[PDB]
CSV table of C-alpha atoms in Angstrom, one decimal:
chain,number,residue,atom,x,y,z
A,1,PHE,CA,6.8,-47.9,19.4
A,2,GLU,CA,5.4,-44.9,18.0
A,3,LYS,CA,2.5,-42.6,19.4
A,4,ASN,CA,0.6,-40.9,16.8
A,5,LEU,CA,0.3,-37.9,18.3
A,6,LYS,CA,0.3,-34.4,17.2
A,7,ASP,CA,0.2,-35.7,13.7
A,8,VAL,CA,3.7,-37.2,13.3
A,9,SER,CA,4.8,-40.9,14.5
A,10,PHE,CA,6.2,-39.4,17.4
A,11,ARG,CA,8.4,-42.1,19.1
A,12,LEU,CA,6.7,-43.1,21.8
A,13,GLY,CA,8.9,-46.1,23.3
A,14,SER,CA,12.5,-46.7,22.1
A,15,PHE,CA,13.3,-49.6,24.5
A,16,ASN,CA,16.9,-51.3,24.2
A,17,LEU,CA,16.1,-54.9,24.3
A,18,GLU,CA,19.2,-57.7,25.1
A,19,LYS,CA,18.9,-61.5,23.1
A,20,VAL,CA,17.4,-63.9,26.1
A,21,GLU,CA,19.7,-66.7,27.2
A,22,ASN,CA,17.0,-69.3,26.0
A,23,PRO,CA,13.8,-68.4,24.5
A,24,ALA,CA,12.1,-71.5,26.3
A,25,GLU,CA,11.7,-69.9,29.7
A,26,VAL,CA,9.6,-66.6,28.4
A,27,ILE,CA,7.5,-69.1,26.0
A,28,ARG,CA,6.6,-71.1,29.2
A,29,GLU,CA,5.5,-67.8,30.6
A,30,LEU,CA,3.6,-66.8,27.4
A,31,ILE,CA,1.8,-70.2,27.7
A,32,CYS,CA,0.8,-69.8,31.3
A,33,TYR,CA,0.1,-66.4,30.5
A,34,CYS,CA,-2.0,-68.3,28.0
A,35,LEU,CA,-3.5,-70.6,30.6
A,36,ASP,CA,-4.8,-66.8,32.4
A,37,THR,CA,-6.5,-66.6,29.1
A,38,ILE,CA,-7.8,-70.2,28.9
A,39,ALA,CA,-9.7,-68.2,32.4
A,40,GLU,CA,-10.6,-64.6,31.0
A,41,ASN,CA,-13.3,-64.2,29.0
A,42,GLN,CA,-15.9,-66.6,27.9
A,43,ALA,CA,-16.6,-69.7,30.9
A,44,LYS,CA,-16.9,-68.5,33.9
A,45,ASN,CA,-20.3,-68.3,31.9
A,46,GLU,CA,-20.5,-71.8,33.4
A,47,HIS,CA,-19.9,-70.0,36.7
A,48,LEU,CA,-22.2,-67.2,37.0
B,1,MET,CA,9.2,-12.9,-0.3
B,2,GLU,CA,8.2,-10.0,1.8
B,3,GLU,CA,4.7,-11.7,2.1
B,4,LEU,CA,5.0,-11.3,6.0
B,5,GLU,CA,4.5,-7.8,5.6
B,6,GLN,CA,1.9,-7.5,3.1
B,7,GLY,CA,0.2,-10.4,5.2
B,8,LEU,CA,0.4,-7.8,7.8
B,9,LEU,CA,-1.5,-4.9,6.3
B,10,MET,CA,-4.3,-6.5,5.5
B,11,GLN,CA,-3.7,-8.7,8.6
B,12,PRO,CA,-7.1,-9.5,10.1
B,13,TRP,CA,-7.1,-8.8,14.3
B,14,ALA,CA,-7.8,-12.1,16.0
B,15,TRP,CA,-8.4,-11.5,20.3
B,16,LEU,CA,-5.8,-13.9,21.6
B,17,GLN,CA,-6.7,-16.7,24.0
B,18,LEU,CA,-4.8,-16.1,27.2
B,19,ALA,CA,-4.9,-17.1,30.6
B,20,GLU,CA,-3.6,-13.6,31.5
B,21,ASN,CA,-4.4,-10.1,30.2
B,22,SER,CA,-5.2,-11.0,26.5
B,23,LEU,CA,-3.6,-8.8,23.8
B,24,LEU,CA,-4.5,-8.6,20.1
B,25,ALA,CA,-1.8,-10.7,18.8
B,26,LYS,CA,-2.4,-10.7,15.3
B,27,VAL,CA,-0.5,-12.7,12.5
B,28,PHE,CA,-0.3,-14.3,9.2
B,29,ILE,CA,1.4,-17.3,9.7
B,30,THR,CA,3.1,-18.5,6.4
B,31,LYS,CA,4.9,-21.2,5.0
B,32,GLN,CA,8.2,-19.4,4.9
B,33,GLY,CA,7.6,-18.1,8.5
B,34,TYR,CA,5.2,-14.9,9.4
B,35,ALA,CA,4.6,-11.6,11.1
B,36,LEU,CA,2.9,-11.2,14.4
B,37,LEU,CA,1.8,-8.1,14.4
B,38,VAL,CA,0.9,-8.1,18.8
B,39,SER,CA,-1.6,-5.0,18.3
B,40,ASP,CA,-3.7,-4.7,21.7
B,41,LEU,CA,-3.6,-1.0,20.8
B,42,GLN,CA,-1.6,-0.4,23.9
B,43,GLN,CA,1.7,-2.0,22.9
B,44,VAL,CA,2.9,-3.1,19.4
B,45,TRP,CA,4.8,-6.4,18.4
B,46,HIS,CA,6.4,-7.9,15.8
B,47,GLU,CA,7.4,-11.1,15.1
B,48,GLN,CA,9.7,-10.8,11.8
B,49,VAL,CA,10.8,-14.5,11.4
B,50,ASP,CA,11.2,-17.4,8.5
B,51,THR,CA,10.0,-20.7,9.0
B,52,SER,CA,13.6,-22.0,9.7
B,53,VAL,CA,14.1,-20.1,12.8
B,54,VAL,CA,10.8,-20.3,14.2
B,55,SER,CA,11.0,-24.0,13.9
B,56,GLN,CA,14.3,-24.7,15.1
B,57,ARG,CA,13.1,-22.3,17.8
B,58,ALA,CA,10.4,-24.4,18.6
B,59,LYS,CA,12.7,-27.4,18.1
B,60,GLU,CA,15.2,-26.0,20.7
B,61,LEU,CA,13.0,-25.4,22.9
B,62,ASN,CA,11.3,-28.7,23.2
B,63,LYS,CA,13.5,-30.3,25.2
B,64,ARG,CA,13.3,-33.4,23.9
B,65,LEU,CA,11.2,-33.4,20.7
B,66,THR,CA,11.9,-35.3,17.4
B,67,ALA,CA,9.9,-33.9,14.8
B,68,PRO,CA,10.4,-32.1,11.5
B,69,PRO,CA,9.8,-28.4,10.9
B,70,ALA,CA,7.2,-29.0,9.0
B,71,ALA,CA,5.2,-30.2,11.6
B,72,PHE,CA,6.1,-27.1,14.0
B,73,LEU,CA,4.9,-25.1,10.7
B,74,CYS,CA,1.4,-26.5,10.6
B,75,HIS,CA,1.5,-26.2,14.3
B,76,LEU,CA,1.8,-22.0,13.9
B,77,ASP,CA,-0.4,-22.4,11.1
B,78,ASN,CA,-3.1,-23.2,13.5
B,79,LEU,CA,-2.6,-19.5,14.7
B,80,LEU,CA,-2.8,-18.2,11.1
B,81,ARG,CA,-5.9,-16.9,13.4
B,82,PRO,CA,-4.2,-16.6,16.7
B,83,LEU,CA,-6.5,-18.3,18.8
B,84,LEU,CA,-4.7,-21.7,19.5
B,85,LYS,CA,-2.7,-23.3,18.1
B,86,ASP,CA,-1.7,-26.1,20.1
B,87,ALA,CA,-1.4,-24.4,25.1
B,88,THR,CA,-3.5,-21.8,26.1
B,89,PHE,CA,-1.3,-18.6,25.7
B,90,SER,CA,0.2,-15.9,27.7
B,91,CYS,CA,1.6,-12.7,26.6
B,92,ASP,CA,4.9,-10.7,28.2
B,93,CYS,CA,3.7,-6.7,27.6
B,94,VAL,CA,6.6,-5.9,29.7
B,95,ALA,CA,8.9,-5.0,26.5
B,96,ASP,CA,9.7,-5.0,22.8
B,97,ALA,CA,10.1,-8.1,22.6
B,98,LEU,CA,6.5,-10.1,23.6
B,99,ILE,CA,6.7,-13.5,24.7
B,100,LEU,CA,3.7,-15.5,23.6
B,101,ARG,CA,3.9,-18.7,25.7
B,102,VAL,CA,2.9,-21.7,23.6
B,103,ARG,CA,3.4,-24.8,26.2
B,104,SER,CA,3.1,-27.8,23.6
B,105,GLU,CA,1.5,-30.3,26.1
B,106,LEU,CA,-0.2,-33.2,25.5
B,107,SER,CA,0.0,-34.8,29.0
B,108,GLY,CA,3.7,-36.3,29.1
B,109,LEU,CA,6.6,-34.4,31.1
B,110,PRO,CA,7.7,-30.6,31.4
B,111,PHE,CA,7.6,-29.0,28.5
B,112,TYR,CA,7.6,-24.8,27.3
B,113,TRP,CA,7.6,-22.9,24.2
B,114,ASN,CA,7.5,-19.2,23.4
B,115,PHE,CA,7.0,-16.8,20.5
B,116,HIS,CA,9.8,-13.9,20.4
B,117,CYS,CA,8.1,-10.9,18.7
B,118,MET,CA,10.8,-8.4,18.9
B,119,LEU,CA,10.8,-4.6,18.1
B,120,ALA,CA,7.8,-3.5,16.0
B,121,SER,CA,8.5,-2.2,12.6
B,122,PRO,CA,7.3,1.3,12.5
B,123,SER,CA,6.1,1.3,8.5
B,124,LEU,CA,3.7,-1.9,9.6
B,125,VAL,CA,3.1,-0.3,13.2
B,126,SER,CA,1.6,2.1,10.9
B,127,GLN,CA,0.2,-0.6,8.6
B,128,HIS,CA,-2.2,-1.5,11.7
B,129,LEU,CA,-1.7,1.5,13.9
B,130,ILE,CA,-1.7,4.6,11.7
B,131,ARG,CA,-2.0,4.2,8.1
B,132,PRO,CA,-5.3,2.1,7.8
B,133,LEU,CA,-6.6,3.3,11.6
B,134,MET,CA,-6.3,6.4,10.1
B,135,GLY,CA,-8.4,5.3,6.9
B,136,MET,CA,-10.8,3.6,9.1
B,137,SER,CA,-11.4,6.6,11.0
B,138,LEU,CA,-11.2,9.0,8.4
B,139,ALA,CA,-14.0,6.3,6.8
B,140,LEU,CA,-16.0,5.8,10.1
B,141,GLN,CA,-16.1,10.1,10.2
B,142,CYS,CA,-17.3,10.7,6.3
B,143,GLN,CA,-19.7,7.6,7.5
B,144,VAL,CA,-21.4,9.8,10.1
B,145,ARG,CA,-21.6,13.0,8.0
B,146,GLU,CA,-23.1,10.9,5.3
B,147,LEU,CA,-25.5,9.5,8.4
B,148,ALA,CA,-26.0,13.3,9.0
B,149,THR,CA,-27.3,13.4,5.7
B,150,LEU,CA,-29.5,10.7,6.2
B,151,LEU,CA,-31.1,11.6,10.1
B,152,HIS,CA,-31.6,15.0,8.3
B,153,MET,CA,-34.1,13.3,5.6
B,154,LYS,CA,-35.4,11.2,8.0
B,155,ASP,CA,-36.2,13.8,10.4
B,156,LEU,CA,-37.8,16.3,7.8
B,157,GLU,CA,-39.6,13.3,6.2
B,158,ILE,CA,-40.8,12.7,9.8
B,159,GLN,CA,-41.8,16.2,10.5
B,160,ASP,CA,-43.3,16.9,6.7
B,161,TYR,CA,-45.5,14.0,7.1
B,162,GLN,CA,-46.7,15.7,10.7
B,163,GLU,CA,-48.1,19.1,9.3
B,164,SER,CA,-49.1,17.6,6.6
B,165,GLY,CA,-51.5,15.1,7.8
B,166,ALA,CA,-52.1,11.7,9.0
B,167,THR,CA,-50.1,12.4,12.4
B,168,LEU,CA,-49.1,9.6,14.6
B,169,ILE,CA,-51.7,9.6,17.4
B,170,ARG,CA,-49.1,8.5,20.1
B,171,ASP,CA,-48.1,11.7,21.2
B,172,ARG,CA,-46.2,9.8,23.9
B,173,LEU,CA,-43.7,8.0,22.0
B,174,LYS,CA,-43.3,9.9,18.9
B,175,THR,CA,-39.5,11.9,18.4
B,176,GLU,CA,-39.1,15.5,18.0
B,177,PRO,CA,-37.9,17.0,15.0
B,178,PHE,CA,-34.3,15.5,15.1
B,179,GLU,CA,-30.7,17.2,13.6
B,180,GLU,CA,-27.7,15.2,13.8
B,181,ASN,CA,-26.0,17.6,15.4
B,182,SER,CA,-28.5,17.2,18.6
B,183,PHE,CA,-27.0,13.5,18.4
B,184,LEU,CA,-23.0,14.8,18.5
B,185,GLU,CA,-23.7,17.3,20.6
B,186,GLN,CA,-24.7,14.7,23.8
B,187,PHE,CA,-22.6,12.2,22.1
B,188,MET,CA,-19.3,14.5,22.3
B,189,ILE,CA,-20.0,14.7,26.3
B,190,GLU,CA,-21.6,11.6,27.3
B,191,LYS,CA,-20.5,8.2,24.6
B,192,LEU,CA,-17.3,10.0,23.2
B,193,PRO,CA,-15.3,10.1,26.7
B,194,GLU,CA,-16.4,6.4,27.3
B,195,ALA,CA,-16.9,5.4,23.8
B,196,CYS,CA,-13.1,5.7,23.7
B,197,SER,CA,-12.2,2.5,25.5
B,198,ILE,CA,-8.5,1.3,24.1
B,199,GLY,CA,-8.6,-1.8,26.6
B,200,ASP,CA,-6.4,-4.9,25.5
B,201,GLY,CA,-7.5,-4.7,22.4
B,202,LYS,CA,-10.5,-6.2,22.5
B,203,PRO,CA,-12.7,-3.1,21.4
B,204,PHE,CA,-10.7,-3.3,18.3
B,205,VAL,CA,-12.4,-6.9,17.4
B,206,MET,CA,-15.9,-5.7,18.7
B,207,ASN,CA,-15.8,-2.5,16.7
B,208,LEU,CA,-13.4,-1.9,15.0
B,209,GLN,CA,-12.2,-5.1,13.4
B,210,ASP,CA,-14.5,-5.1,10.6
B,211,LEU,CA,-14.1,-1.8,9.4
B,212,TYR,CA,-10.2,-2.1,9.6
B,213,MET,CA,-11.6,-5.1,7.0
B,214,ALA,CA,-13.4,-3.1,5.0
B,215,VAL,CA,-9.8,-0.7,4.7
B,216,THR,CA,-7.3,-3.1,4.6
B,217,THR,CA,-6.9,-2.1,0.6
B,218,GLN,CA,-4.3,0.5,1.9
C,1,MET,CA,6.4,18.0,28.7
C,2,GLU,CA,3.6,16.2,30.3
C,3,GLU,CA,1.7,19.8,29.9
C,4,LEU,CA,2.5,19.6,26.5
C,5,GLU,CA,1.4,15.8,26.0
C,6,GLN,CA,-2.2,17.0,27.8
C,7,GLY,CA,-2.5,19.6,25.4
C,8,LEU,CA,-1.6,17.4,22.3
C,9,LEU,CA,-4.5,15.3,24.3
C,10,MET,CA,-7.0,18.1,23.9
C,11,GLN,CA,-5.9,20.2,20.6
C,12,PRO,CA,-6.9,19.0,17.7
C,13,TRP,CA,-5.2,16.9,14.9
C,14,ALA,CA,-4.2,19.5,12.1
C,15,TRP,CA,-2.3,18.2,8.8
C,16,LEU,CA,0.8,19.7,7.7
C,17,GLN,CA,-0.2,21.5,4.7
C,18,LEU,CA,2.9,21.0,2.4
C,19,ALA,CA,0.6,18.9,-0.1
C,20,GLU,CA,3.7,16.2,-0.7
C,21,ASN,CA,2.6,13.1,2.2
C,22,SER,CA,-0.2,12.2,4.8
C,23,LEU,CA,1.7,14.0,7.6
C,24,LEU,CA,-1.1,14.6,9.6
C,25,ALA,CA,-0.5,16.4,12.5
C,26,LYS,CA,-2.1,17.8,16.2
C,27,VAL,CA,-1.0,21.0,16.7
C,28,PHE,CA,-0.6,22.3,20.3
C,29,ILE,CA,2.0,25.3,20.1
C,30,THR,CA,2.1,26.6,23.7
C,31,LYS,CA,5.1,28.3,25.7
C,32,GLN,CA,7.9,25.8,26.9
C,33,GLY,CA,7.8,24.3,23.6
C,34,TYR,CA,4.8,22.1,21.7
C,35,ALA,CA,3.6,18.9,20.5
C,36,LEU,CA,3.0,18.5,17.2
C,37,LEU,CA,2.3,14.8,16.7
C,38,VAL,CA,3.1,14.3,13.2
C,39,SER,CA,2.5,10.5,11.6
C,40,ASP,CA,3.7,10.1,7.6
C,41,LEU,CA,1.1,7.2,7.8
C,42,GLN,CA,4.2,4.9,7.7
C,43,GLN,CA,5.7,5.5,10.8
C,44,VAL,CA,4.8,6.6,14.3
C,45,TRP,CA,6.1,9.4,16.1
C,46,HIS,CA,5.6,11.4,19.0
C,47,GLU,CA,7.0,15.1,19.5
C,48,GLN,CA,6.4,15.3,22.8
C,49,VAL,CA,9.5,18.4,22.6
C,50,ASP,CA,9.9,21.1,25.0
C,51,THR,CA,11.6,24.6,24.2
C,52,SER,CA,15.5,23.3,24.8
C,53,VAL,CA,15.0,20.4,22.2
C,54,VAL,CA,12.3,22.5,19.9
C,55,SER,CA,15.4,25.2,19.7
C,56,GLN,CA,18.2,21.9,19.0
C,57,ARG,CA,15.9,21.1,16.2
C,58,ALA,CA,15.4,24.0,14.9
C,59,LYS,CA,19.6,24.5,14.5
C,60,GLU,CA,20.0,20.9,13.9
C,61,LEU,CA,19.2,21.7,10.1
C,62,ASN,CA,20.4,25.1,10.6
C,63,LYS,CA,23.7,26.7,9.1
C,64,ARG,CA,24.1,30.4,9.7
C,65,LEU,CA,20.6,31.7,10.8
C,66,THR,CA,20.0,31.3,14.5
C,67,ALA,CA,17.8,32.7,17.2
C,68,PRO,CA,17.3,32.2,21.0
C,69,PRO,CA,16.1,29.5,22.7
C,70,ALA,CA,12.8,31.1,23.4
C,71,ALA,CA,13.0,33.0,20.3
C,72,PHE,CA,13.6,29.8,18.1
C,73,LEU,CA,10.0,28.5,20.2
C,74,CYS,CA,7.8,31.3,19.3
C,75,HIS,CA,9.2,31.7,16.1
C,76,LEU,CA,7.7,28.2,15.6
C,77,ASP,CA,4.6,29.6,16.8
C,78,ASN,CA,4.5,32.5,14.6
C,79,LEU,CA,5.1,29.6,11.8
C,80,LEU,CA,2.2,28.1,12.1
C,81,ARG,CA,0.2,30.9,12.9
C,82,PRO,CA,-0.6,31.7,8.5
C,83,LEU,CA,-1.3,28.2,7.8
C,84,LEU,CA,-1.4,26.1,10.7
C,85,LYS,CA,-2.5,27.5,14.1
C,86,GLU,CA,6.4,31.1,7.7
C,87,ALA,CA,3.6,28.8,5.5
C,88,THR,CA,5.7,26.8,3.6
C,89,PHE,CA,5.8,23.3,4.8
C,90,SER,CA,7.6,20.1,3.5
C,91,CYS,CA,9.5,16.8,4.9
C,92,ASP,CA,11.5,13.7,4.3
C,93,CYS,CA,8.6,10.5,4.8
C,94,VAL,CA,12.1,8.2,4.4
C,95,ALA,CA,13.6,9.2,7.4
C,96,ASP,CA,13.3,7.3,10.4
C,97,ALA,CA,13.0,10.4,12.4
C,98,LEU,CA,10.4,12.9,10.8
C,99,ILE,CA,12.3,15.8,9.8
C,100,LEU,CA,9.8,17.9,8.4
C,101,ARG,CA,11.3,20.2,6.1
C,102,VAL,CA,9.8,23.1,7.2
C,103,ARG,CA,12.0,25.7,5.4
C,104,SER,CA,10.1,28.9,6.5
C,105,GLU,CA,12.1,32.5,5.7
C,106,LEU,CA,12.8,35.3,8.3
C,107,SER,CA,15.5,37.6,6.1
C,108,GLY,CA,15.5,36.1,2.4
C,109,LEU,CA,18.5,33.7,3.3
C,110,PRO,CA,17.6,30.4,3.5
C,111,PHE,CA,16.1,29.0,7.2
C,112,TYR,CA,15.9,25.4,8.1
C,113,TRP,CA,12.8,24.1,10.5
C,114,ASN,CA,12.1,20.4,11.1
C,115,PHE,CA,9.2,19.5,13.3
C,116,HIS,CA,11.5,16.1,14.3
C,117,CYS,CA,9.0,14.0,16.0
C,118,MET,CA,10.7,11.2,18.4
C,119,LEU,CA,10.0,7.9,16.8
C,120,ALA,CA,7.3,6.7,19.0
C,121,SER,CA,7.9,3.1,20.5
C,122,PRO,CA,5.1,1.2,20.8
C,123,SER,CA,4.7,2.0,24.4
C,124,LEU,CA,4.6,5.7,23.3
C,125,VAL,CA,2.3,5.0,20.4
C,126,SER,CA,-0.6,4.6,22.9
C,127,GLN,CA,-0.6,8.2,24.5
C,128,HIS,CA,-1.7,9.8,21.1
C,129,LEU,CA,-1.9,7.5,18.2
C,130,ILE,CA,-4.3,5.2,19.8
C,131,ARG,CA,-6.3,6.8,22.6
C,132,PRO,CA,-7.6,9.7,21.4
C,133,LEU,CA,-7.3,8.2,17.4
C,134,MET,CA,-8.9,5.1,18.8
C,135,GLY,CA,-11.1,6.8,20.9
C,136,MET,CA,-12.9,8.7,18.6
C,137,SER,CA,-12.6,5.8,16.2
C,138,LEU,CA,-15.0,3.9,18.4
C,139,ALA,CA,-16.8,6.7,19.2
C,140,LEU,CA,-17.3,7.1,15.3
C,141,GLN,CA,-18.3,3.6,15.5
C,142,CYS,CA,-21.0,4.0,18.2
C,143,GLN,CA,-22.2,6.7,16.2
C,144,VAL,CA,-22.8,4.7,13.1
C,145,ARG,CA,-24.7,2.4,14.9
C,146,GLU,CA,-26.9,4.8,17.1
C,147,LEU,CA,-27.8,6.7,13.9
C,148,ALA,CA,-28.3,3.9,11.8
C,149,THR,CA,-31.1,2.6,14.7
C,150,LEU,CA,-32.5,5.9,14.7
C,151,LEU,CA,-32.6,6.1,11.0
C,152,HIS,CA,-34.2,2.4,11.2
C,153,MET,CA,-37.2,3.4,13.9
C,154,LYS,CA,-37.8,6.9,11.9
C,155,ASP,CA,-38.4,5.1,9.0
C,156,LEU,CA,-40.5,3.0,10.9
C,157,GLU,CA,-42.2,6.1,11.5
C,158,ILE,CA,-41.9,7.1,7.8
C,159,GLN,CA,-43.5,4.2,7.1
C,160,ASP,CA,-46.2,4.2,9.5
C,161,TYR,CA,-47.0,8.1,7.9
C,162,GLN,CA,-46.9,6.5,4.3
C,163,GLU,CA,-49.4,3.8,5.6
C,164,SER,CA,-51.7,6.7,6.9
C,165,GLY,CA,-51.2,9.0,4.6
C,166,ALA,CA,-50.1,8.8,1.0
C,167,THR,CA,-49.0,12.4,0.7
C,168,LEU,CA,-45.2,12.9,-1.1
C,169,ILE,CA,-44.0,16.3,-0.3
C,170,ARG,CA,-40.7,17.0,-1.8
C,171,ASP,CA,-39.0,13.4,-3.2
C,172,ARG,CA,-35.8,15.3,-3.0
C,173,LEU,CA,-34.5,14.3,0.3
C,174,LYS,CA,-36.8,11.4,0.1
C,175,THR,CA,-34.8,9.0,2.4
C,176,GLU,CA,-34.2,5.2,1.4
C,177,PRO,CA,-34.5,2.6,3.4
C,178,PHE,CA,-31.6,2.5,5.5
C,179,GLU,CA,-29.4,-0.7,6.1
C,180,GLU,CA,-26.6,0.2,8.0
C,181,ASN,CA,-24.3,-2.7,6.0
C,182,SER,CA,-25.6,-1.5,3.0
C,183,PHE,CA,-24.6,1.8,3.7
C,184,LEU,CA,-20.7,0.9,4.7
C,185,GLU,CA,-20.3,-1.3,2.1
C,186,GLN,CA,-21.2,2.1,-0.4
C,187,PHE,CA,-19.0,4.6,1.9
C,188,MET,CA,-16.2,1.6,0.8
C,189,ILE,CA,-16.8,2.2,-2.6
C,190,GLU,CA,-16.3,6.1,-3.2
C,191,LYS,CA,-14.8,7.4,-0.3
C,192,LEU,CA,-12.2,4.1,0.6
C,193,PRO,CA,-10.1,6.0,-1.4
C,194,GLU,CA,-10.3,9.3,0.7
C,195,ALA,CA,-10.0,6.5,3.7
C,196,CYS,CA,-7.1,4.1,2.8
C,197,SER,CA,-5.4,7.0,0.6
C,198,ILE,CA,-6.0,9.8,3.3
C,199,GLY,CA,-3.9,12.0,1.1
C,200,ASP,CA,-4.4,15.0,3.0
C,201,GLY,CA,-6.0,14.4,6.1
C,202,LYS,CA,-8.3,17.7,6.1
C,203,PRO,CA,-11.6,15.5,6.2
C,204,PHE,CA,-10.4,13.6,9.4
C,205,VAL,CA,-9.3,16.8,11.0
C,206,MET,CA,-12.4,19.7,10.3
C,207,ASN,CA,-14.5,16.5,11.1
C,208,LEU,CA,-13.2,14.5,14.2
C,209,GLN,CA,-11.2,17.4,15.9
C,210,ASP,CA,-15.2,17.9,17.2
C,211,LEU,CA,-14.6,14.5,19.0
C,212,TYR,CA,-10.8,15.2,19.7
C,213,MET,CA,-12.1,17.5,21.9
C,214,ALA,CA,-13.8,15.4,24.4
C,215,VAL,CA,-11.7,12.7,23.7
C,216,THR,CA,-8.9,13.1,26.4
C,217,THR,CA,-10.8,11.3,28.2
C,218,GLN,CA,-8.4,8.2,28.6
């Protein structure tokens, strides 16, 4: 990812990823972060 | 195209912003380099560099940079009037090579970039320390002479008005019959010794830069 | 030496009377050398010479006609007597060292004198091309400002006199309503060729050596 600083799309990141063993695990991580979402910006309305 | 020296005869005197002793680093930044005739009226420098050499200087002095030469060319054009091109500037007024430090910093990891104004070309030294300075000195002097004529005419006007009637009644705030030499005699002993203030270039940009620009024609 | 440098700092400018280039020289010819700082409007110099280097410079262009060292020194002192302060002047503006081709004659056989000026380093220029020159220039700027405000207040008095008495007297030295900027602009028209193209520099000397007499404060 690049940060457009000093009028140039300067390289803000160059991250050497690696292929996951199985996307299912990070998908489960994504859907548990999804539960944190489900509790994040408009339902504790009920609470307060 | 030799516009660096041509831009160094009409070169506007811009007061460099420093954290140190501020000098009159003045330059005509071009797309093919520049000519930074640092003339603080104390020591004269000149950065006779093209765009390629200064751009590669910035790239090599930026430790880990992925930028085009045009990016630093615009960085330099920000110093076309050398006020601030970014960090804050810092001169090295020790030798014939002025190190005008420009720390390319935007809150990351260490950097250090600087200019290298090698020995000033005496021709362009005269183009901003002798020839148009000679010119603006003579211009100011004959200006003072024409002002001598103007003061003499106004003094004789006021006087010949006083003895011809309608003399002002506020005798305690009027002026005696004046003349230019009466001003010059007191100037030579009071102001001329103290108006002789070379300073770090700032006296030029407060009083001499304007009439210099008026005499940049040659 | 420093004695001759100081004398240069006090003894006034005086243009080399060669009618070839704007070789505005500062005359200080006193024993154990001299100080004739000559500027060609395209290079900076500082001829802070002593009698030994004076005589060796006199010999460097001479081939068959020579003299003792002090003989050379007092000869070149006499050289400026009829014309500056042997009344033949010339130079080569191209040379990096200002070889003032002063071909004064003594025997009817050629004699070669050069007011060889040492090339002024950017630290050397501050001694005399800046401190006295820019001192008198800032002094002239202050003179212009002070004379301008004095003209304005005297014209206020004048207008009070017409509004108290409508008498007209001479209409020959009747001043126009003075403006400092208008004065500067009207000066940058006709006297600018005098200023930018110095030519002789005689108007510079016989009108600014009064300022030079007391610009030596720095």
